[PDB]
Design a protein around this ligand. Structure first.
Ligand SMILES: [Cl-]
Ligand SMILES: [Mg+2]
Ligand SMILES: [Mg+2]
Length: 354
């Protein structure tokens, strides 16, 4: 019984002003960079997961796999981590995302799973059967983990494997992405479902797109690197290049530090990127126009971020015009603070009004 709209309609829908480029700081001073760098690695160390909690995620997987195969024997039911839990970007307070696979299609009834998990002591058990991807949500009070589960959405397993591959290519990607994600949680702009802002997966695509567009690039366009694609276990070629040992080091030509990349990330999205004209596409690794995708007609197209496996889908579709204006303001707010090295203020915890 509470409204979670992050960006109030009183914000309006107007485009932000194009700032005189000579007034937009182009690089960190040496003092600001050095201190921001040490602050970011201190933040990253606190964000890194601990082994005790990582063990709890795997125990939840095992517990769930046992519950399911005991209740419905014979169907080779398997339980897989994905999302943050499988792409190297989770922290200890990250929820668990789980994909349950089986050829037994009758398991795709998420409320049947809710009844079983409730009966065996899970708490806050809810099922959402009308979502694009039906889910069951639980709180495990023994392991103290929140968990969203779906059944047989293998597409999410592949784009998790893709993000994991991107994270594995250059060692700056994991700390950069974790710190930006932490920023999105603290400013509460990571809630596409109820807040009208952007999903964590949308944010990760924006980070990867920015890194692909650096000169030199930090990350390649994996979907376009046909010669480094391996054959998967199902016999088909991978959709994206995934021979990690051959890919590792691709970004080594780019010599910018973590501090400079965080500054440039916010500078890019605060002032450089023309939201009105372009679509970000980590599938291509280059900018696309909205018009070449017919996305000038798309409802909720202020921000266009192409899903790399279904390029008909805009990940930015959860932000209407008002929400985009507030997101853009948050990105400029972040740029102004990181330009002066103020990582703590940048990550101030947003609280909803009463
Ligand atoms: Cl993630
Ligand atoms: Mg989740
Ligand atoms: Mg529009």
């Amino acid at each position: 019984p509470f409204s979670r709209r992050r960006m109030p309609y009183s914000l309006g829908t107007d485009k932000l002003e194009k700032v005189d480029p000579d007034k937009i700081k182009s690089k960190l001073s040496e003092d600001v960079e050095r201190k921001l760098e040490t602050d970011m690695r201190e933040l990253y160390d606190r964000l890194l997961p601990t082994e005790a909690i990582e063990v709890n995620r795997r125990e939840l997987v095992s517990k769930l796999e046992r519950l399911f195969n005991t209740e419905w024997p014979g169907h080779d039911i398997r339980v897989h981590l994905f999302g943050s839990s499988g792409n190297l970007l989770c922290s200890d307070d990250s929820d668990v995302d789980i994909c349950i696979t089986t050829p037994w299609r009758e398991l795709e009834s998420v409320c049947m799973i809710a009844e079983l998990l409730d009966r065996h002591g899970m708490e806050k058990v809810v099922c959402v059967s009308s979502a694009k991807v039906p889910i069951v949500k639980i709180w495990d009070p023994e392991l103290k983990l929140a968990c969203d589960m779906n059944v047989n959405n293998t597409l999410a397993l592949e784009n998790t494997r893709m993000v994991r591959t991107y994270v594995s290519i250059d060692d700056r990607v994991r700390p950069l992405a974790m710190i930006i994600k932490y920023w999105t949680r603290r400013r509460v702009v990571n809630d596409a479902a109820f807040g009208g802002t952007l999903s964590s997966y949308t944010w990760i695509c924006m980070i990867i797109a920015f890194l692909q567009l650096r000169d030199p690039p930090v990350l390649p366009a994996l979907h376009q690197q046909h010669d480094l694609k391996l054959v998967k276990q199902d016999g088909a070629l991978s959709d994206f290049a995934d021979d990690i040992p051959k890919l590792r080091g691709f970004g080594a030509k780019n010599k910018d530090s973590l501090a400079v990349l965080l500054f440039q990330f916010f500078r890019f999205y605060a002032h450089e990127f023309d939201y009105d004209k372009y679509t970000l596409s980590i599938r291509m690794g280059t900018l696309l126009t909205k018009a070449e995708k017919n996305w000038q007609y798309l409802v909720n197209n202020a921000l266009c971020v192409e899903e790399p496996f279904n390029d008909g889908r805009n990940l930015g579709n959860t932000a209407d015009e008002t929400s985009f204006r507030g997101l853009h303001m948050e990105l400029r707010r972040a740029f102004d603070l990181i330009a002066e090295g103020k990582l703590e203020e940048c990550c101030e915890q947003y609280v909803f009004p009463k």
